[PDB]
Amino acid sequence: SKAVTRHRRVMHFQRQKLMAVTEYIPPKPAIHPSCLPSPPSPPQEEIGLIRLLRREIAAVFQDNRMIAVCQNVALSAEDKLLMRHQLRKHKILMKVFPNQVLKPFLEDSKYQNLLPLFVGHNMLLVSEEPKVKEMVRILRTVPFLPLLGGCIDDTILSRQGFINYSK
C-alpha cells in the first residue's frame, strides 16, 4: 500500500516494538505531593469592598446609639419593603451586613458579646433616637418575626429588656 493511507496502516513488528519501548515515562515522586503537608497559602489581599464595610459598620455602632438585632426572615419583598417604609416613618433604618465581615469586627471590640447572635440571615434595626416603643408595635404585625436582642446606650439587652424599656 501507499506510505500515507487514510486508515491507520499497521506498523512493522520491529517498528512497533521500537514505539512500545520508547514510550514516555512520567517521573514518579517518592512521596505523593498530596500526602505531604502543603505549604501555607499565599496571603490574600483584602477586597476594597470588605474594608469599605468595616468603615461603614464601625460608623453604625458609633453614630446611632440604639442597635436592634433581628433575624431577616424570608418575607416577601412587598411585605419586607412595606415594613421598611413603616420603619422609615419613625426614622428607623434596616441595615444588613454579612456575618463574615461583621463577626471579625465584633471579635475585637466593645460589642463582643453580640457575636453569638449573628448566626444566619440577620438584619440590624438602628436609629439615633431609641424609639423602642414605636418599633415593637411594627414588629407585632408579624408573629413569625423574632426579635433577637440589641444594645442600647452601650448596654446589651435582650428582647424583654426592650419591652421594659419601651414601657
Binding site: 500500500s1 486508515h7 499497521v10 513488528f13 512497533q16 516494538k17 521500537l18 512500545a20 519501548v21
Partner: protein, 94 residues
C-alpha cells in the same frame, strides 16, 4: 467467527500483532549492549596520521604469499615406482 480477510500478516487488513512484556525487555537488552559499543569506539588509540603506514610491510608481504601460491600451480610429478606398483595385483604364492 474471527476471519481475517486474505492472508494473516500481509495485505490491507492484517492480523494485529502486539508486543509482549519480555519482547520489550529483549529489545532494551539489545540496546544496552550497543549503547556500550558506542562508548568504546569513541576512544581511538592513534589518529589517522599516526596510523598511516604502520602495516604496509605486513600487508605487502601477505599478498606476496598469495601470489606465490597462485603462481606455483602445476601438475604433480609422476614417479616411475607408482606405475610399476600396479603389477602387484597379480602377486601370488608359488
Amino acid at each position: 467467527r474471527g476471519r481475517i480477510p486474505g492472508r494473516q500478516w500481509i495485505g490491507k487488513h492484517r492480523r494485529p500483532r502486539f508486543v509482549s512484556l519480555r519482547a520489550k525487555q529483549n529489545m532494551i537488552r539489545r540496546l544496552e549492549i550497543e549503547a556500550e559499543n558506542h562508548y568504546w569506539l569513541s576512544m581511538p588509540y592513534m589518529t589517522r596520521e599516526q596510523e598511516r603506514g604502520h602495516a604496509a610491510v605486513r600487508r605487502r608481504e601477505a599478498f606476496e604469499a598469495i601470489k606465490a601460491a597462485a603462481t606455483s600451480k602445476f601438475p604433480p610429478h609422476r614417479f616411475i615406482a607408482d606405475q610399476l606398483d600396479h603389477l602387484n595385483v597379480t602377486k601370488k604364492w608359488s
